[PDB]
Amino acid sequence: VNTALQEVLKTALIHDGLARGIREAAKALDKRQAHLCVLASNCDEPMYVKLVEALCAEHQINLIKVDDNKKLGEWVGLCKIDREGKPRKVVGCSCVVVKDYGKESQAKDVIEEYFKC
Amino acid sequence: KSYTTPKKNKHKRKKVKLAVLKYYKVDENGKISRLRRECPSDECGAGVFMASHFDRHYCGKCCLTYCF
């Protein structure tokens, strides 16, 4: 499902279906428009983890677990430059709401049937 | 350079850490409890709050002050 997360992240990047920022995510949950969510767990935070699934696991919310903050940040491309090597300075992101409108693809039905059960 | 007249510095906004702690109250139950009054203006969304003064609240870029 990692390649499904990769293709839905590149779909969000190519269709502007991403709203990076946890207060933008809180606004998305408050405006009743959240479809897919990505969660970061077992990372370096004393009190942030309790608030992040407290404000994530409300209703009709998918659960994706990421081991490290920086690996999701490198994946989402906060500073995606210099592809002949590595990105220079990317911080670790934790939560993002994928408000994508692109639906007709290959792995979209697969990830929707995986998350429907 | 250093002139004769003094100059007031610009409004350097102090960084406040863990602000997402101070928006909702979390209990054993999963139901949230907002601590700030919500702005009903259509220019801003339903996720925004109001400012926390000591007499009455204050909206965001709407700049609308509501009394009691």
Ligand SMILES: [Zn+2]
């Ligand atoms: Zn407003």
